[PDB]
Scaffold this active site. Structure first.
Site, PDB file in Angstrom:
ATOM      1  N   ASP A 195       0.933  -1.303  -0.267  1.00 50.33           N
ATOM      2  CA  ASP A 195       0.155   0.193   0.112  1.00 50.33           C
ATOM      3  C   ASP A 195       0.743   1.422  -0.173  1.00 50.33           C
ATOM      4  O   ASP A 195       1.495   1.557   1.004  1.00 50.33           O
ATOM      5  CB  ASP A 195      -1.248   0.079   0.961  1.00 50.33           C
ATOM      6  CG  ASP A 195      -1.610   1.240   1.793  1.00 50.33           C
ATOM      7  OD1 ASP A 195      -2.126   2.001   0.524  1.00 50.33           O
ATOM      8  OD2 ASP A 195      -1.543   1.300   3.392  1.00 50.33           O
ATOM      9  N   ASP A 219      -2.930   5.683  -5.014  1.00 52.28           N
ATOM     10  CA  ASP A 219      -2.484   4.676  -3.969  1.00 52.28           C
ATOM     11  C   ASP A 219      -2.472   3.595  -4.693  1.00 52.28           C
ATOM     12  O   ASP A 219      -4.415   3.068  -4.663  1.00 52.28           O
ATOM     13  CB  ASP A 219      -4.314   5.094  -3.261  1.00 52.28           C
ATOM     14  CG  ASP A 219      -4.215   4.745  -1.869  1.00 52.28           C
ATOM     15  OD1 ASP A 219      -3.350   3.597  -1.547  1.00 52.28           O
ATOM     16  OD2 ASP A 219      -5.255   4.766  -0.851  1.00 52.28           O
TER      17      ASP A 219
HETATM   18  C1  LIG Z   1      -4.670   8.408   2.954  1.00 56.11           C
HETATM   19  C2  LIG Z   1      -6.173   7.392   2.687  1.00 56.11           C
HETATM   20  C3  LIG Z   1      -6.248   7.463   2.048  1.00 56.11           C
HETATM   21  C4  LIG Z   1      -4.761   5.851   2.350  1.00 56.11           C
HETATM   22  C5  LIG Z   1      -6.097   4.083   2.728  1.00 56.11           C
HETATM   23  O1  LIG Z   1      -6.290   4.385   4.431  1.00 56.11           O
HETATM   24  C6  LIG Z   1      -4.917   3.118   1.913  1.00 56.11           C
HETATM   25  O2  LIG Z   1      -4.477   3.499   0.841  1.00 56.11           O
HETATM   26  C7  LIG Z   1      -6.038   2.458   2.590  1.00 56.11           C
HETATM   27  C8  LIG Z   1      -4.851   0.897   2.491  1.00 56.11           C
HETATM   28  C9  LIG Z   1      -5.798   0.029   2.512  1.00 56.11           C
HETATM   29  C10 LIG Z   1      -5.804  -1.876   2.513  1.00 56.11           C
HETATM   30  C11 LIG Z   1      -6.095  -2.739   2.563  1.00 56.11           C
HETATM   31  C12 LIG Z   1      -6.852  -2.893   4.428  1.00 56.11           C
HETATM   32  C13 LIG Z   1      -7.862  -1.698   4.287  1.00 56.11           C
HETATM   33  C14 LIG Z   1      -6.750  -0.456   4.049  1.00 56.11           C
HETATM   34  N1  LIG Z   1      -6.869   2.540   1.540  1.00 56.11           N
HETATM   35  C15 LIG Z   1      -8.314   2.089   2.019  1.00 56.11           C
HETATM   36  O3  LIG Z   1      -8.385   2.539   3.100  1.00 56.11           O
HETATM   37  C16 LIG Z   1      -9.687   2.032   0.632  1.00 56.11           C
HETATM   38  C17 LIG Z   1      -9.705   0.459   1.188  1.00 56.11           C
HETATM   39  C18 LIG Z   1     -10.772  -0.270  -0.801  1.00 56.11           C
HETATM   40  O4  LIG Z   1     -10.107   0.172  -0.763  1.00 56.11           O
HETATM   41  N2  LIG Z   1     -11.363  -1.546  -0.119  1.00 56.11           N
HETATM   42  C19 LIG Z   1     -11.887  -1.565  -1.231  1.00 56.11           C
HETATM   43  C20 LIG Z   1     -13.036  -0.619  -1.560  1.00 56.11           C
HETATM   44  O5  LIG Z   1     -13.263   0.420  -1.705  1.00 56.11           O
HETATM   45  N3  LIG Z   1     -14.151  -1.058  -3.214  1.00 56.11           N
HETATM   46  C21 LIG Z   1     -14.910  -0.084  -3.277  1.00 56.11           C
HETATM   47  C22 LIG Z   1     -13.793  -2.446  -3.642  1.00 56.11           C
HETATM   48  C23 LIG Z   1     -11.962  -2.077   1.420  1.00 56.11           C
HETATM   49  C24 LIG Z   1     -13.427  -1.651   1.497  1.00 56.11           C
HETATM   50  C25 LIG Z   1     -10.796  -2.998   1.710  1.00 56.11           C
HETATM   51  C26 LIG Z   1     -11.154  -2.872   3.081  1.00 56.11           C
HETATM   52  C27 LIG Z   1     -10.472  -3.983   3.814  1.00 56.11           C
HETATM   53  C28 LIG Z   1      -9.998  -4.933   2.411  1.00 56.11           C
HETATM   54  C29 LIG Z   1     -10.513  -4.769   1.166  1.00 56.11           C
HETATM   55  C30 LIG Z   1     -11.295  -3.698   1.139  1.00 56.11           C
HETATM   56  C31 LIG Z   1     -10.539   2.253   0.590  1.00 56.11           C
HETATM   57  C32 LIG Z   1     -10.195   4.472  -0.307  1.00 56.11           C
HETATM   58  C33 LIG Z   1      -9.743   5.014   0.439  1.00 56.11           C
HETATM   59  S1  LIG Z   1      -9.275   6.239  -1.176  1.00 56.11           S
HETATM   60  C34 LIG Z   1      -9.414   5.203  -1.501  1.00 56.11           C
HETATM   61  N4  LIG Z   1     -10.087   5.266  -3.232  1.00 56.11           N
HETATM   62  N5  LIG Z   1     -10.016   4.209  -1.525  1.00 56.11           N
END
Ligand SMILES: CC(C)C[C@H](O)[C@H](O)[C@H](CC1CCCCC1)NC(=O)[C@@H](CC(=O)N(CC(=O)N(C)C)[C@@H](C)c1ccccc1)Cc1csc(N)n1
Ligand SMILES: CC(C)C[C@H](O)[C@H](O)[C@H](CC1CCCCC1)NC(=O)[C@@H](CC(=O)N(CC(=O)N(C)C)[C@@H](C)c1ccccc1)Cc1csc(N)n1
EC number: 3.4.23.15
Lengths: 333, 334
Positions: free
Chosen positions: A35, A219
């Site tokens: 990540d 990301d």
């Molecule tokens: C500065 C922040 C935006 C950084 C962010 O916290 C980190 O990238 C973080 C790392 C993830 C690594 C797996 C464990 C959950 C967290 N991603 C996130 O928090 C993204 C999670 C993320 O992408 N998902 C899937 C998801 O959103 N869809 C739509 C499938 C969540 C459900 C997830 C959780 C657990 C397991 C699998 C998936 C949400 C996001 C924020 S901006 C964006 N476009 N999407």
């Protein structure tokens, strides 16, 4: 040095991409998410309670079994956009590809079902910078660099569209087999985060948003591309997608009818046609199809920001250059 | 010597990996599988009765068109785990990866439809020892070793994953550092004549559920799947909650992505396969069954009973078959 370590990635539904790592001696193997949005490495701890079903369904780290292990015990709470995890901080040697490095990492003790009961992998390997490190623990990449070894101070990501090879991460360089043309670079706005300035998002012909600049995080741990609530609203309206509880849908057969979306980065356009941003499970007039764009409201200091997640990286092979603090892009293959 | 030569393989759905060879003058080209579990070379013969449909669907070798042929005539039956073929011995010039040897091979005239009608290839190149050779005929690698051209007395295998890429590759004479990473870990064979090695345990999940005390493992490129004895696979399958279909084990596709790791304890190192490595995740439906790339195979003594590490394993682990020092080395493929 003149090294490069490839890490093979599984792609699960185009929403989760992960590879293996080994912690300890002899190593234990975990599935992790690499990540770029964070800087801590964490896996579940055998000291995690079965009260949490997440632990009950995930590989756990057993410190007892590690010759090389090292106690530490500092508590830590890592907070993600989507969830929170807490545990304490250990040390051991982590095996990544052919590389080995002594990592300080967290052993997770509290992990919620939401969302961890939906994760197919076990933990996460923060590819972020130390500025964002919970506990100022040095991120793994930093540690790898120190050891010389790699030919270049960059790592690349290739994400595949699920059908094969799900993806690949190259530490020390890039795989010219997985991209066409040459890279075009976009400098970091500032060090500490993998975030660049964007200067327009166009729907079809016209710049519809972010007219006088805005930010984009690149990301690798974001499934979809997100934008602030207000931009996504605007954007979807322009596309004519509709809010279905959770996501935005379009009639399957109408997918091909949607316009291209372009992200104006570093003087170039990065264009996505509907084929790249709609999950066309069908082409039926009878079914709703999902868009891999979502609204996300990121709090300062980081946001308000656009996040270019797997949606974009599926299309553009990405290179993270620590040496020059720039991110490069080429079209993937 | 100084040559290194490679054969590029085609990957058919992860189960068949075949390369080409030329036989005769002018060459007659054939698709073949390179198999370390056997030591004969064979192709279908122009003498093969059209009554065998497999012989209507594959290239046949016609000696009447070859100026370099030498008749032999000796009859030979080749038994494999999953089928048999009969024919007779012939001799002609074989070109593999650029190397040319005068090889004694079999002209198969009796070729059953099962399994052969399902084969994308025409014949087999046995990459094993003369100990296993039917007819005591010299194996091809050995003949190559006689020419004194290879830099090293090794041959290696790269098996790739598919596409909708390069299918795989054999390197004759060395290894290819673009296809592996890290270092080799060598296991020595139990004895010459068979590519088999000592295995101390197989773990499902955590628990060396199986092969306590120890077992044998044949490293066999001529096998699509990993195989254990029937009683071992019985246990294994139960642990994974897999369901025995005709010839295979299956699991609800949705159950797929969470199946536990299976580890192979070899030469002191542990070789781990993740669910991704051994399930044909052809879907996520709770309403579809997905095949596991593992199955039972009862190998008779002397080789067997054994486990056989097939294309499923080689895919994650580049394999070096070292004749010079009688050993097998695995590295992490890339
Ligand atoms: C500065 C922040 C935006 C950084 C962010 O916290 C980190 O990238 C973080 C790392 C993830 C690594 C797996 C464990 C959950 C967290 N991603 C996130 O928090 C993204 C999670 C993320 O992408 N998902 C899937 C998801 O959103 N869809 C739509 C499938 C969540 C459900 C997830 C959780 C657990 C397991 C699998 C998936 C949400 C996001 C924020 S901006 C964006 N476009 N999407
Ligand atoms: C000492 C013995 C174990 C050695 C064994 O006879 C040889 O390795 C033998 C040579 C094959 C070369 C291609 C032509 C068929 C024969 N492989 C084998 O017999 C393996 C064949 C083999 O793997 N297959 C495919 C197969 O089993 N599945 C499930 C696709 C057979 C059915 C086949 C059918 C159609 C086309 C091609 C191949 C079965 C096996 C035995 S141990 C193991 N893990 N798998």
């Amino acid at each position: 040095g003149n090294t490069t370590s490839s890490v093979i990635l599984t792609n699960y539904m185009d929403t989760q991409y992960y590879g293996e790592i080994g912690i300890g001696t002899p190593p234990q193997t975990f599935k992790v998410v690499f990540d770029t949005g964070s800087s801590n490495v964490w896996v579940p701890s055998s000291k995690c309670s079965r009260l949490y079903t997440a632990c009950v369904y995930h590989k756990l780290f057993d410190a007892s079994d590690s010759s090389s292990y090292k106690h530490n015990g500092t508590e830590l709470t890592l907070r993600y956009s989507t969830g929170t995890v807490s545990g304490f901080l250990s040390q051991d040697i982590i095996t990544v590809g052919g590389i080995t490095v002594t990592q300080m990492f967290g052993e997770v003790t509290e992990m919620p079902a939401l969302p961890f009961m939906l994760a197919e992998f076990d933990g996460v390997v923060g590819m972020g910078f130390i500025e964002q490190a919970i506990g100022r623990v040095t991120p793994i990449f930093d540690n790898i660099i120190s050891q010389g070894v790699l030919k270049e101070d960059v790592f690349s990501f290739y994400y595949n569209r699920d059908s094969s090879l799900g993806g690949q991460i190259v530490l020390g360089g890039s795989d010219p087999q997985h991209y066409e043309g040459n890279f075009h670079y976009i400098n970091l706005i500032k060090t500490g985060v993998w975030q660049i300035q964007m200067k327009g998002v166009s729907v079809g012909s016209s710049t519809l948003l972010c007219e006088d600049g805005c930010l984009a995080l690149v990301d690798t741990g974001a499934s979809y591309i997100s934008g602030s609530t207000s931009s996504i609203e605007k954007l979807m309206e322009a596309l004519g997608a509709k809010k279905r509880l959770f996501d935005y849908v379009v009639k399957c057969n109408e997918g091909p009818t949607l316009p291209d979306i372009s992200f104006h980065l570093g003087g170039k356009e990065y264009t996505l046609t509907s084929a790249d941003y709609v999950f066309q499970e069908s082409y039926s007039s009878k079914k709703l199809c999902t868009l891999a764009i979502h609204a996300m409201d990121i709090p300062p200091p980081t946001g308000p920001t656009w996040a270019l997640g797997a949606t974009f990286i599926r299309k553009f092979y990405t290179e993270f250059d620590r040496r020059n603090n720039r991110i490069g892009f080429a079209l993937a293959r």
